[PDB]
Amino acid sequence: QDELTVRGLVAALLIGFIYTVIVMKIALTTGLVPTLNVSAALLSFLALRGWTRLLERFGVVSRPFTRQENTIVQTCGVACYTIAFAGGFGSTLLGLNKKTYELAGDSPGNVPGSWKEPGIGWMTGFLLACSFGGLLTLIPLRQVLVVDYKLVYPSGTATAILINGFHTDQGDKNSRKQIRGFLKYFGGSFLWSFFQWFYTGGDACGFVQFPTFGLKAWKQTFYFDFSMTYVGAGMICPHIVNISTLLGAIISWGIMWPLISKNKGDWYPAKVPESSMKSLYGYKAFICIALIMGDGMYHFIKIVGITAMSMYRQPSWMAYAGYALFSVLAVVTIPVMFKQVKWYYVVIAYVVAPMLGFANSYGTGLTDINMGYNYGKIALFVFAGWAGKENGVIAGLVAGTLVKQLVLISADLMQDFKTSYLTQTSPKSMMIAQVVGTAMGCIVSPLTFMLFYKAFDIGNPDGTWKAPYALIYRNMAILGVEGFSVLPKYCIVISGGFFAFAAILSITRDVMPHKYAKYVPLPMAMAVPFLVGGSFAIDMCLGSLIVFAWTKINKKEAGFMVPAVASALICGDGIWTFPASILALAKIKPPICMKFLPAA
Amino acid sequence: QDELTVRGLVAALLIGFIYTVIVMKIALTTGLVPTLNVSAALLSFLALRGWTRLLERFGVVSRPFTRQENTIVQTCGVACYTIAFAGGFGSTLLGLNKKTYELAGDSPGNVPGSWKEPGIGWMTGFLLACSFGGLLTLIPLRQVLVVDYKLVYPSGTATAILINGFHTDQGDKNSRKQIRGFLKYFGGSFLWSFFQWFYTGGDACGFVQFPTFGLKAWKQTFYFDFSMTYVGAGMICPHIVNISTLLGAIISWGIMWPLISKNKGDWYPAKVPESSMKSLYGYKAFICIALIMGDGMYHFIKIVGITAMSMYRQPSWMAYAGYALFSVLAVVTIPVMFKQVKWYYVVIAYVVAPMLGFANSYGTGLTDINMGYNYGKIALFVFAGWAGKENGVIAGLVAGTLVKQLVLISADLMQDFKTSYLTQTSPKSMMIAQVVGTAMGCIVSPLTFMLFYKAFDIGNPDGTWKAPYALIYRNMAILGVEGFSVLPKYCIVISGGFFAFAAILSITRDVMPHKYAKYVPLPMAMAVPFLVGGSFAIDMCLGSLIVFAWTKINKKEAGFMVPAVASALICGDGIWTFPASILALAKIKPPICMKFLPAA
Ligand SMILES: CC(C)CCC[C@@H](C)[C@H]1CC[C@H]2[C@@H]3CC=C4C[C@@H](OC(=O)CCC(=O)O)CC[C@]4(C)[C@H]3CC[C@]12C
Ligand SMILES: CC(C)CCC[C@@H](C)[C@H]1CC[C@H]2[C@@H]3CC=C4C[C@@H](OC(=O)CCC(=O)O)CC[C@]4(C)[C@H]3CC[C@]12C
Ligand SMILES: CC(C)CCC[C@@H](C)[C@H]1CC[C@H]2[C@@H]3CC=C4C[C@@H](OC(=O)CCC(=O)O)CC[C@]4(C)[C@H]3CC[C@]12C
Ligand SMILES: CC(C)CCC[C@@H](C)[C@H]1CC[C@H]2[C@@H]3CC=C4C[C@@H](OC(=O)CCC(=O)O)CC[C@]4(C)[C@H]3CC[C@]12C
């Protein structure tokens, strides 16, 4: 009790509903889904405190609003609208339409019978079959990642400190300074993000696209964006993670991509545009996943090996028993909706999902970057190649959704579990909130999507309701119909080499003594700057430099003030994401565009 | 003794010589003469300390290098290169050439016999006749302005604190914090100015031309440039000065100029470009000088009235006796060089010079802005109208130089006297340094100018050595040949109205009780934003806002730390002016141009 409340369920439903509308409409118009996890924590506090104070004003007495209750409300609210974008409503499930089929055009794999129309009944059934699969895998993941590996989730840590500060009324020698120090940088970060908004009024202009080291380095993604989220995240991360991130940027963007791009006419065709698996993006996706798989497989096998040895020498199996039940339920249900999907396609997806989900959850616990979109695109490509021209596009799209959603749900909610750990929230109550929130998400989102779908015209390339990613994901399946031959030359060989390189580094860190194991780079921390630019790496290294400078200047103060200052920078930028979404919701666009030119 | 040293004279000659070359070449190529007063103080310290330490390394003993000696060296050095730009070598004396005469073209007033060629003999004689006139007027001005009126010269105050910090080795509870606090902001301001340099690579782009309130307000000069000099200057100025500066910007740029510009076809011709006395710049120059004259005349008359009453009831006259001697020497000498100039033209110039010099020196003591260039342009216009088409262009140019130089010398060296006051430097030793420095300036500058003039081609509009202001000043004289009829409609009436308005405000402040005299705006502080934009006013108000916020937060700390922090911001930007000049000297230009566009 005192954590699961009726008022909390009502507040979570309201927050989950309004956030679903914001996420859905933005996805159906621009496709740039914002991260609104931090804003939900603030809205949960304001809504419930206002309700309690309203009762106080009228004389009605209510139960005290504690920090554990606030975490549960955010947890239920987050899972409600997470399905809105993790379910592929604007990316993959929208790519099954006949409208998207016609936009793709006449091409191999795009057979006349590979289009599906949206509907409330099948979408709700599709989500319920697969949404409750990731939740069961989370229970074993919480122990190994949050409490055993002690991974720091910067978004989870920042939200936990924010939630604690709201409910911390104790007067201590440090508590007062923690809150006041948090407020000074929270307001500054929010105003800084608010100020930047007026000058990001075009393609690649603003403080985000600032060439701090010149235009030549900026085009190589080696600039410094003024993002306090990445600076704040890097402050609470260990230096080895921040250094490893810089190495990945230098190896990929400073060495590898310039060298590989020198063969734009020999290795891969030059007529095809970039950002496609046939041209220079095959290297981006496959090498990046190779590093994570090379490191993720070693860790996952080691955990199984340790567990196997412990049992041989002698609720963990309860979660997997329930996971198998939902896995079978999905296997018997999904091919009924889609004749294209075969029964064993779903079995393979569910078998490798805990492994893929573990890798992304582990990666999110180091660099605060959720790479579940990359896994869905890779899973879409391989599954599309597992079927011929017939029943291939739908097979890739549907199988991609299962992998994309389960992996995204895992990483997103692991940070939410990190918040519960720091706020002394009961894990069993957290499990109930996610199940209730996910169940409502599987009902609200299909209803919300159909309300937009029926009222407006979605998918028109020359209209307000344009979904660019619906066609992009459709083209990935069409290109994925053909096998691995479409990948550029030496793409598999280099990926296999980096798989070995990732494997060697993982082994090297656990075999060498602890003295020399503090300097081995992390293979999957280096993998993040392979898809995103090196600007993220520079920001993380700046955060470590600030902590390194602060620690030397004042060892005592930096011990307890760095988490508070780092959280304020993350929260302040995170809070502004809600007004920025509303401005984007109301078609209000930035007035000015701060462009940089080479003294033309 | 201990202030006038042989090593100081040698160092001042070297600093004065190198600064003359930098000022002369920049004036002959771009015309944007930098303010290098702060950089001279640092170079004086480094040069002499290195000389003393070199003697220490070799075992040679030397007299201790004190703060008074440092002030004298900067004083002699500043006066040496001040004549380089205050003498109109690149603006007015270059406008007398036959090359400039041909560029002006066929127009009334530009008679065939109104060109003069440069020469070492007459230029040296011309300067010696008029350069030592302003110095004598300074001696009475020091008492009334520096010590009696207690005007704060932000550049003089900042240099004095910088010079004191170099020679302050005492260990006190506050002295250590004063120096360390100065160093933190001095390095930050220097790096900030250094960082901005790479992005100001074009016409109106960079952090200086930042539309902090939108593009509409920026075109109205109501933006916030990131200039730490103006922010630092406003911190040590009283709030009434900073508020009055904002009022002048709102009245002129927010009300007057938009309304007057609405008559671009009726009041003044629209074909003629702006920034000319015939179109919208007559209002800028005449109204701005009207406010200063309205306030300056009241103060100057009051000082004479107080002095007259004191004598009636009963070295001041020594300075004026010497000033009259040089005034007569100029009168008998200048018309010999120029047949165009008549004897009584010089007499009128020297009679009104102490009045004009007092007004600019008083204005420089409030807003740290030297407006002697405006007086020279106004003096050029009226004196050109005092002669017909014959002997009119030369009469305006020559008479403009006397007014421009004497007024510029007064304001520039009054800040130097403010430095001596705070550094406990002997005023009589300061007088000797200025005379020696001015005498060398009248010799080095004509030699330096002729070295460039003989070696290269100066005045070519399509060459590296282009002097835009030489022709602009030439056109002012040609337009000034015709009388006050060329001024736009109602220009004199509005200027006369603001003359009364300035007079009323000056009287109102001294007649009302001290309780209500703290809120009367200063007429000549409002006059500064009439020529420059309102961005300067905003920066000054930001500095007052910082002090107002700092004082409320910590009354004790803001008492002694504000001058140190304000000086560091001014000095840091001032020091960078020297490397920026060297980069401009070596034809090195900024790489990037940070342009702002309306989301085109
Ligand atoms: C003490 C700390 C704060 C150091 C400050 C960081 C410097 C190492 C950075 C800041 C500005 C940077 C410069 C910003 C811009 C350029 C322009 C760039 O020239 C271009 O190529 C621009 C486009 C073009 O000219 O074609 C060359 C690198 C350079 C000098 C960068 C080099 C590295 C600099 C000096
Ligand atoms: C200390 C922390 C806070 C970050 C500071 C990093 C920068 C000072 C340095 C480190 C890595 C450097 C980069 C390392 C590698 C490259 C690759 C190089 O790319 C190419 O070789 C061009 C290839 C082509 O022509 O396409 C251009 C310089 C650049 C961007 C360097 C620019 C300056 C960077 C970003
Ligand atoms: C708490 C403190 C820090 C307040 C922050 C200052 C605000 C009062 C300033 C900062 C940004 C300013 C905005 C910056 C840019 C614009 C664009 C401007 O639109 C334009 O006209 C741009 C050119 C065009 O669109 O044609 C309208 C004013 C506005 C909203 C400005 C209004 C005033 C703002 C919000
Ligand atoms: C508080 C301190 C630190 C300075 C902050 C000042 C700004 C918040 C305000 C004060 C004065 C304002 C200005 C007052 C007057 C005008 C005149 C107005 O000009 C016109 O009427 C346009 C004329 C034309 O169309 O040519 C445009 C708005 C502007 C620039 C305002 C923009 C916003 C300003 C700069």
Numbering used by the authors:
A (entry chain B), B (entry chain A): 46 to 359, 393 to 678
Sentences from the paper on this structure:
Poaceae species use a unique chelation strategy, whereby plants secrete a high-affinity metal chelator, known as phytosiderophores (mugineic acids), and reabsorb the iron-phytosiderophore complex by the yellow stripe 1/yellow stripe 1-like (YS1/YSL) transporter for efficient uptake of iron from the soil. Here, we present three cryo-electron microscopy structures of barley YS1 (HvYS1) in the apo state, in complex with an iron-phytosiderophore complex, Fe(III)-deoxymugineic acid (Fe(III)–DMA), and in complex with the iron-bound synthetic DMA analog (Fe(III)–PDMA). The structures reveal a homodimeric assembly mediated through an anti-parallel β-sheet interaction with cholesterol hemisuccinate. HvYS1 comprises two distinct domains: a substrate-binding YS core and a scaffold domain, implicating an elevator-like transport.
The cryo-EM map was reconstructed to an overall resolution of 2.9 Å with an imposed C2 symmetry. The structure of HvYS1 reveals a homodimeric structure. Four CHS molecules within the HvYS1 dimer are assigned, and two of them are present between the protomers (see also “Dimer interface”). The first 47 residues and the linker between TM6 and TM7 were invisible owing to their flexibilities. The N- and C-halves in the scaffold domain are pinned through a disulfide bond between Cys250 and Cys671. The overall structure of the HvYS1 protomer represents an outward open conformation, as the central cavity is wide open to the extracellular space, whereas the base of the cavity is sealed from the cytoplasm. The scaffold domains from each protomer comprise the dimer interface with a buried surface area of 936 Å2. Each protomer’s C-terminal β -strands (S1s) form an anti-parallel β-sheet to assemble the dimer. In addition, a cluster of the hydrophobic residues including Phe240 and Tyr244 on TM4, Phe252 and Phe255 in the TM4–H4 loop, Phe271 in the H4–H5 loop, Met672 and Phe674 on S1, pack together to stabilize the dimer. The side chain of Tyr451 in the apo structure points inside to occupy the Fe(III)–DMA binding site.
